[PDB]
Design an enzyme around this catalytic site. Structure first.
Site, PDB file in Angstrom:
ATOM      1  N   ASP A  77       0.809  -1.219   0.000  1.00  0.00           N
ATOM      2  CA  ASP A  77       0.000   0.000   0.000  1.00  0.00           C
ATOM      3  C   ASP A  77       0.850   1.281   0.000  1.00  0.00           C
ATOM      4  OD1 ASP A  77      -2.198   1.621  -0.084  1.00  0.00           O
ATOM      5  OD2 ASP A  77      -2.966   1.114   1.911  1.00  0.00           O
ATOM      6  N   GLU A 129       2.432  -2.436  -5.133  1.00  0.00           N
ATOM      7  CA  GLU A 129       2.204  -1.028  -4.776  1.00  0.00           C
ATOM      8  C   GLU A 129       3.424  -0.355  -4.178  1.00  0.00           C
ATOM      9  OE1 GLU A 129      -1.428   0.331  -3.053  1.00  0.00           O
ATOM     10  OE2 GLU A 129      -2.591  -1.393  -3.793  1.00  0.00           O
ATOM     11  N   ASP A 178      -0.896 -10.079  -5.732  1.00  0.00           N
ATOM     12  CA  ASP A 178      -2.210  -9.582  -5.393  1.00  0.00           C
ATOM     13  C   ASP A 178      -3.112  -9.711  -6.617  1.00  0.00           C
ATOM     14  OD1 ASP A 178      -4.466  -8.333  -4.561  1.00  0.00           O
ATOM     15  OD2 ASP A 178      -3.533  -6.340  -4.297  1.00  0.00           O
TER      16      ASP A 178
HETATM   17 MG    MG Z   1      -4.345  -1.200  -2.657  1.00  0.00          MG
END
Ligand code: MG
Ligand code: MG
Ligand code: MG
Lengths: 249, 255
Positions: A11, A41, A151
């Site tokens: 994140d 990310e 992911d």
């Molecule tokens: Mg995200």
DNA sequence: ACGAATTCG
DNA sequence: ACGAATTCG
């Protein structure tokens, strides 16, 4: 001959508490000292931090601007042989497929990660991307062990629409008997980072593998990043997955 | 006037008349009524009627009996030409999961020596409510199939459908036909909601859809004759009667 | 990076 | 009553 790894969407797009959270991610990595780390990310200053903090790893990245994936390879354990990036021509979120060819001793691997197209709205593109990933998994020589960890943003129904996993590709969580303790990797009841005032949970982060019969055997799967930092938030809105496997010849 | 030669024909208009837009509503209602006066349809199926709009219809379309789908908010209506249509009963079927007060309104009548079940609805709106819209379509199609075999069933309304959604439904049942499809998919009346040609909603983009549709249950006994758009003229205020075009359809009831 | 609601063009 | 983008809960 064993291989251990963490996959984690960290994140980097959340600027709030980002330096503390990056340090939090690496404190977790230090505890487990994995052979390989697959990240999603990552942003440029986060990558710059990793190049210093994880200087003991070879760092391969999926892009140089925006946000992107990375694969970290522990020096002395993993020999880096090449990297390959495959585009997703219809992505609207700069997503792609990052692969590295490596060895651990005598065992050759193709290690792959991606951050598949996000949100319910983009299901169709995410499915197309999954097909690209599965196609690429079939390309390696039979003697090479292929592991995808990333992911996927997948819902189970989307894998069904995709045709289901091929007969020679396995999901590590499924292989290990679908353990409840590490099922959900994104959980807004347990994780407050996104400040979503509702309870939703998904198994977005997944591990797929292709190996000659009994040449790759998952041994453990665990969630990481489960502890709050000083700021009262977690390293990421996702939990990471720590996986250990044996290579059995 | 409707004479002997046209006695085998049912004519109707279906039109979402956008009663939720209060601006210029009385003038726009007069525009709708001018269209009804011009074509003198036997039946009119309306959506987005509101209570004040019923008063406008009583004033400017007084030759029609008004049957409504609810008493407050916004709702559908079926209008029946006095002296032509004999009203036998009205049925309302709920859509238990609607978030927009939608339902299925059916009126049983006799017209031209034949019994009809005339149905309308305004199915759940917007792309986001596709699942509920599909459930409602299934309710409609189920009801069409349930009618006595001797009765002629016609549905006309604002379905909000995208073509992919009817397929997800499995397609229309074997004895149920879409009038536009039956007539060979004519281009002139394909789109009933078109933001390039219609600016009532002030959407600064060009999108067009066949939201308004006519389904009928038939073998060979009901034959569409024509389908045309209405409401394409701007009124004095510079706006259209509605954000939708209306559909004018004529069908023959055959031995 | 949830679903629902709302804004914008 | 469009699709995309953003905001709200
Ligand atoms: Mg995200
Ligand atoms: Mg074990
Ligand atoms: Mg409307």
């Amino acid at each position: 001959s064993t291989i251990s790894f963490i996959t984690w969407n960290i994140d980097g797009l959340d600027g709030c508490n980002l330096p503390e959270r990056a340090r939090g991610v690496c404190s977790c990595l230090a505890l487990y000292s994995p052979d390989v780390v697959f990240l999603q990310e990552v942003i440029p200053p986060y990558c710059a931090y990793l190049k210093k903090r994880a200087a003991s790893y070879t760092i391969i990245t999926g892009n140089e601007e925006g946000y992107f994936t990375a694969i970290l390879l522990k020096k002395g354990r993993v020999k880096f042989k090449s990297q390959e990036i495959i585009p997703f021509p219809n992505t609207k979120m700069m997503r792609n497929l990052l692969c590295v060819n490596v060895s651990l001793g005598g065992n050759e691997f193709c290690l792959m990660t991606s951050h598949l197209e996000s949100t319910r709205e983009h299901s169709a593109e995410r499915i197309r991307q999954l097909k690209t990933v599965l196609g690429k998994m079939q390309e390696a020589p039979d003697s090479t062990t292929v592991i995808f960890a990333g992911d996927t943003n997948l819902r189970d129904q989307e894998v069904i629409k995709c045709g289901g996993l091929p007969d020679n590709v396995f999901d590590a969580w499924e292989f290990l008997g679908k353990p409840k303790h590490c099922q959900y990797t994104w959980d807004t009841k347990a994780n407050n980072n996104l400040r979503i005032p509702a309870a939703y949970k998904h198994r977005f982060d997944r591990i797929f593998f292709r190996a000659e019969e009994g040449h790759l055997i998952p041994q453990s799967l665990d969630l990481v990043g489960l502890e709050k930092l000083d700021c009262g938030r977690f390293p990421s809105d996702h939990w990471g997955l720590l996986c250990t496997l044996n290579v059995v010849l």
